[PDB]
């Protein structure tokens, strides 16, 4: 059989080169990098090369940190709770601004901070499916400890005005964090242009393994560790390093940035072919703006039949997609989809819809 | 060349069967287990089997939780900070008792809680290298939120009186957590006999991959999540599951408990052969008790030459061991060491010592 995977904003396939580069550290190179003997220092060159790939992947400077975490959820929890202790409890800046579109790892943590007494304003989305940047400014009081706005939304693919939010935060002296998970491998990511203090990402959204992530911390910026222990990652995140996943995630970031032109010109062309073909049937409307989007995502809405039925049908024909709040059908492509797959999805989608 | 790895309390080699069982989930079975389509539910049987292996591995009940974490450091941080919010800030039980022998993931986090105003007593070790259990009782005031005592020490191999501490905690109504990382695969681990509310472990200490751990939470016991997001692990720990490492860690726990007789009878016999051979030279004394120890660990001290020099020398001859606070030389064996390796280590150790 031949199945079609169109659920890449939920997770992606590991690139074969990533698995290949991870294998030796699952085999004979199992030393703890903190060890002083040869099994430990034996791992240091590959770890350094992987970290270098990450730094260059997000345009991080040598003075900055790219701390290895276990997923984007850890990065987001670490940002929000760290600034809760450093900037909210100790500096009296008991206010955080974020958006209603943020991943549950951000919104649920913000709810937890609210339970402790922190004041959090979740900026409402507009009809364009985006946040303006004027909204954060309206909400940035002199007690805002942190602004947290995701770079690209996982349900609609919509790109938020990261850069202008960073400029507002820079002029107003408030820390800026961006959840950039959906942006890696989709659009160019530059922490300097974003003026980001914190940036989150997760490997399994750009063809690395599930269970490893990264938090960019700007030079000089403090953040009380979420993982105390003080051994690893310059004492900022303790725990024995996941060497294979570090190497693999480095390679995945490298491949992801190397495929940016292909992502916009080819994957985006497949998404536009799919979307244009799919809107030529009854009343199926795309949910959100069609310009400020990452190249791989389309979110289509169909009459009065729920999206879950359409997805159950698609899955019966071995086509995997997800839902999306509008419910609508989220189809998210990748580097490994082909035009034949897209034509097939147009046919199976139409036949399933009329049925 | 033929190198000798005697540093297994620092980390271990992945069992070939563990790598084998992980490989398919690094290849074609890359679905997100939260997905509703076939790529997601396709992973559910192997995840369930792995979790079953963990539960049976620590004698957890079906009503209990064995939450998948990213390492023992995450489990320990989660226990201590969770009971800080639930039992210290909300219930006024602003006291925690632990030991001075605990891993830095516990002691450093306790230091962080002290910086917030929590009163923590670190029980001092005695001349026997152990904690009595009478000490926790002496310190268990009616404001103790948590007792945290490691099952086996990583530097000396000494087993602490887990069970009696659990009985004291049960009679006095105080939560009991045990860091059991060094115990898995070394001695039988039973959360019921221990009367443990929380138990930590980490795969790479029993031949699973680095970067995954487990926290046993007793039925009914609450613990505010460290990873908010509320999606995965019954909402107790959010983040996309590390499917390959979950499967591998399950197999590693199974193999580890299946080798307990071999660990005590063979690995312990190799440790006793090594230790008895090594104490027949000048004034090299074993640091700590020689009865209440896990079968794989020996911690030897040598005259007035520091341990780091002896270990640099050993590493020059491709023999990997670590230091240990006494500094002494920690040699920690495993299922994969042979008697030939041990004889060779006796010779190289003697020649290095006289040189
Ligand atoms: C090794 C060890 C740890 C650290 O585990 P990580 O996987 O590095 O998080 C914690 N406690 C004990 C007793 C250990 O031996
Ligand atoms: C998928 C996603 C996450 C969750 O990442 P995990 O690896 O599951 O921790 C967080 N934020 C965004 C924007 C995501 O798309
Ligand atoms: Cl914290
Ligand atoms: Cl928490």
From Swiss-Prot, chains A, B:
The modification N6-(pyridoxal phosphate)lysine is found at residue 205. Its cofactor is pyridoxal 5'-phosphate. It is found in: Cytoplasm. Its EC number is 2.8.1.7. One of its GO terms (biological process) is [2Fe-2S] cluster assembly. Keywords: 2Fe-2S, Cytoplasm, Iron, Iron-sulfur, Metal-binding, Pyridoxal phosphate, Transferase. Pyridoxal 5'-phosphate binds at residues 72-73, 154, 182, 202-204, 240. SUPFAM superfamilies: PLP-dependent transferases. Homodimer. Forms a heterotetramer with IscU, interacts with other sulfur acceptors. Belongs to the class-V pyridoxal-phosphate-dependent aminotransferase family. NifS/IscS subfamily. This is Cysteine desulfurase IscS. The gene is iscS.
């Amino acid at each position: 059989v031949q199945r079609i995977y169109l659920d890449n904003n939920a997770t992606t396939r590991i690139d074969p080169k990533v698995k290949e580069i991870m294998d030796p550290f699952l085999r004979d190179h199992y030393g703890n990098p903190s060890s002083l003997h040869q099994f430990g220092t034996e791992t240091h060159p590959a770890i350094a090369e992987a970290l270098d790939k990450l730094y260059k992947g997000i345009n991080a400077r040598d003075i900055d940190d790219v701390i290895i975490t276990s997923c984007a959820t850890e990065s987001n929890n670490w940002v929000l709770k760290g600034v809760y202790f450093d900037e909210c409890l100790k500096k009296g800046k008991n206010h955080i601004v974020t958006t209603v579109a943020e991943h549950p790892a951000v919104r649920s943590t913000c709810n937890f901070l609210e339970s402790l007494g922190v004041e959090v304003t979740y900026l409402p989305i507009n009809e364009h499916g985006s946040i303006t940047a004027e909204q954060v400014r309206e909400a940035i009081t002199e007690k805002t400890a942190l602004v947290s706005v995701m770079w690209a939304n996982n349900e609609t693919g919509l790109i938020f005005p990261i850069e202008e939010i960073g400029a507002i935060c820079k002029e107003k002296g408030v820390l800026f964090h961006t959840d950039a998970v959906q942006a890696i491998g989709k659009i160019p990511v530059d922490v300097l242009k974003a003026n980001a203090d914190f940036l989150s990402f997760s490997a399994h959204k750009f063809h690395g393994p599930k269970g490893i992530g990264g938090l960019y911390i700007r030079s000089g910026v403090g953040l009380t560790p979420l993982f105390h222990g003080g051994e690893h990652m310059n004492g900022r995140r303790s725990g024995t390093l996941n060497v294979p996943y570090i190497v693999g995630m480095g390679e995945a970031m490298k491949l992801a940035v190397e495929h940016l032109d292909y992502e916009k010109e080819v994957v985006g062309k497949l998404r536009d072919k799919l979307e244009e073909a799919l809107l030529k049937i009854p009343d199926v409307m795309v949910v959100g703006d069609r310009i400020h989007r990452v190249p791989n995502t389309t979110l289509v809405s169909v009459r009065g039949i729920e999206g879950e039925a359409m997805l159950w049908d698609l899955n019966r024909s071995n086509i995997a997609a997800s839902t999306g709040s509008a419910t609508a059908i989220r189809l998210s492509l990748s580097r490994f989809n082909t035009e034949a797959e897209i034509d097939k999805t147009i046919e199976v989608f139409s036949q399933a819809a009329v049925r």
